[PDB]
Amino acid sequence: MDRSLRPEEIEELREAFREFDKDKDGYINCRDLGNCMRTMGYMPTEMELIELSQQINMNLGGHVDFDDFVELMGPKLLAETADMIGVKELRDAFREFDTNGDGEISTSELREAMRKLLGHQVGHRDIEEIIRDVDLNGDGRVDFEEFVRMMSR
């Protein structure tokens, strides 16, 4: 996957998984598959549902353990955009970067959040890169609108 799943995300998937597994009586249909992807904040397309349901229903033959489930659904959860997430959760994400709660993400606050997300330290040069990429109003910090875009296509 693009990056490692956070503990809160593993719990989101665990919850999706219980729903998936209750629903699954041998096989899984698209209404069900779709709904428990929604349980984890992701709106699938019917194309996606057909692919996924065929994988689950033919290849694994209905035997999906949590590990299988995370291989399939992991990427989708990581791929959620701003408009699926909702405001309160975006707010929360932002919070987590804005450790001092002053409504602005400082370049060292970015550094820590990036370290925690990617699971390794990020270079001085790279973090400077990110800011210039991200800051619309050219004040060297990251605010909420700025941060939302960072997760918007």
- Chosen residue from 11, 102, 129, 145 binding Ca ion by CB under 5 A: 102
d(CA 96, CA 102): 12
- Tell me if 98 contacts Ca ion by CB under 5 A: yes
Residue 123 token pair:
């270079």
Say if residue 137 carries a ligand binding annotation.
yes
Q: Which range of residues in 14-22, 71-79, 95-103, 111-119 is near Ca ion by CB under 5 A? A: 95-103
Q: Which range of residues in 11-19, 41-49, 56-64, 91-99 is near Ca ion by CB under 5 A? A: 91-99
Q: Map residue 136 onto helix, strand or coil.
A: coil
- Tell me if 133 contacts Ca ion by CB under 5 A: no
Q: Which range of residues in 3-11, 36-44, 101-109, 115-123 is near Ca ion by CB under 5 A? A: 101-109
- Among residues 112 and 135, whose Cβ is nearest to Ca ion? 135
d(CA 77, CA 141): 27
Tell me the H-state helices in 39-106: 46-54, 66-78, 82-85, 87-97
Nearest to 73 by CA among 147, 17, 117, 119: 17
CA-CA-CA-CA torsion sign (126, 132, 133, 137): positive
- Among residues 39 and 106, whose Cβ is nearest to Ca ion? 106
Say if residue 32 carries a ligand binding annotation.
yes
d(CA 46, CA 106): 41
Task: Check if the beta carbon of residue 40 is closer than 8 Å to that of residue 77.
Answer: yes
- Chosen residue from 2, 87, 100, 119 binding Ca ion by CB under 5 A: 100
- Among residues 57 and 106, whose Cβ is nearest to Ca ion? 106
User: For binding to Ca ion (CB under 5 A), which residues are involved?
Assistant: 98, 100, 102, 104, 106, 109, 135, 137, 139, 141, 143, 146
Binding residues for Mg(2+): 21, 23, 25, 27
